[PDB]
Amino acid sequence: GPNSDLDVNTDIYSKVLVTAIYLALFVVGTVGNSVTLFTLARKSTVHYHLGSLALSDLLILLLAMPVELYNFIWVHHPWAFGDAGCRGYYFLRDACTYATALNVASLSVERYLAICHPFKAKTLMSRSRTKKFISAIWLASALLAIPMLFTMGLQNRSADGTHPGGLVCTPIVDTATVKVVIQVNTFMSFLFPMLVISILNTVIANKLTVMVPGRVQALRHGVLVLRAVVIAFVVCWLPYHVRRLMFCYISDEQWTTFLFDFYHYFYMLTNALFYASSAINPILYNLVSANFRQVFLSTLNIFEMLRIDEGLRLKIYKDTEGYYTIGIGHLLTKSPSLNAAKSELDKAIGRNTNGVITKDEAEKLFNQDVDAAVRGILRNAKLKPVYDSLDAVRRAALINMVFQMGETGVAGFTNSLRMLNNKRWDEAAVNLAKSRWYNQTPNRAKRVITTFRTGTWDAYGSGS
């Protein structure tokens, strides 16, 4: 036959398996991302990025999966969508690919700022700049896909010069360009976003762990999700860009019937995983938020520690030393004047409180104070290297001290600090337990000392 070599040899099982899979991903991903859009619409800046991500993934399924399933899984030749179809389909495939790539990446950069740079995030961001940001990543996505309009194209590969059943869509340009094009795709669609996602997520994950049983269980799944997101990206997208690079980097000299046959099976695997990304993303990225169980499934360390040690009160009290305090250990003033406090409390939040506040207002204060303590530690020579060397749990204990006594108070524990720095847990504990601190607040200090000497939550059985 004149096209007989363009025949792809693959098990009919295999073709029936991948099809069943493909369509399974297709409903779950079309529904999930639709329902996601339906859910997000009826609801700071993450909600738009999640929606942008939802679209980009919905489009991968609707634009890429149908033609691939006809023309790449079953009927390999001929290409039944003409030359412009060939150019339009790889363009649109690539565009959505970049959109998802740039969305996932942006979404991580967005949550990096929210949690590690909340000052900027507040003043130097809004829902205007967000939509300016999102416009840019379809604008850019569409831009980056343009090469595909010129490198792809129809071609008659049949042994005879031209026979209608041997037309194929394929890179119809020299390998010096096609290798270059495919390695820009790989770099911008995978590596750049790999570095971004893998780094920032892990940085966010670590910071979030130190920040954060029932009341904070949401945030602890969020951490696991943050790490899951990276594994998900790698596994679903790495084989896809291997196959695209293998396509162009193996020379016609080295190609063999076996390799030819391998590739087309590898195609079934790689692309099935690729479509998985779009299907799971809506579920993975929306897990952390409340209403997950609800919305999709209808369609069928420092906070805890201080919450215990400082407690929570809504009226003004006098702390251990006798100073007017409110909420989660927020010292209002050292004055003995009960009015002077009320004045400073109204100033604090910005309204005539009369010495009483709401839980939201207490938790807003807390975060400002913890921010303050952590900046305190990171900006201090005597505290940064100690903190840097400690694990998530012991870091929190160091913050408990700074929250209680201040940055320059804790800098006074010159040797107890050195000992923690050098993992001499027992010696630190004994020397810490001989302090004025320990005398004033034995219960709290002993829990904090236990935390330093164990690295566990043994002290905080009362946590909720």
């Binding site: 194929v168 396509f247 030819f260 087309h264």
Partner: peptide, 6 residues
């Protein structure tokens, strides 16, 4: 002989 599909 090599793949034409990408």
């Amino acid at each position: 002989r090599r793949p034409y599909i990408l």
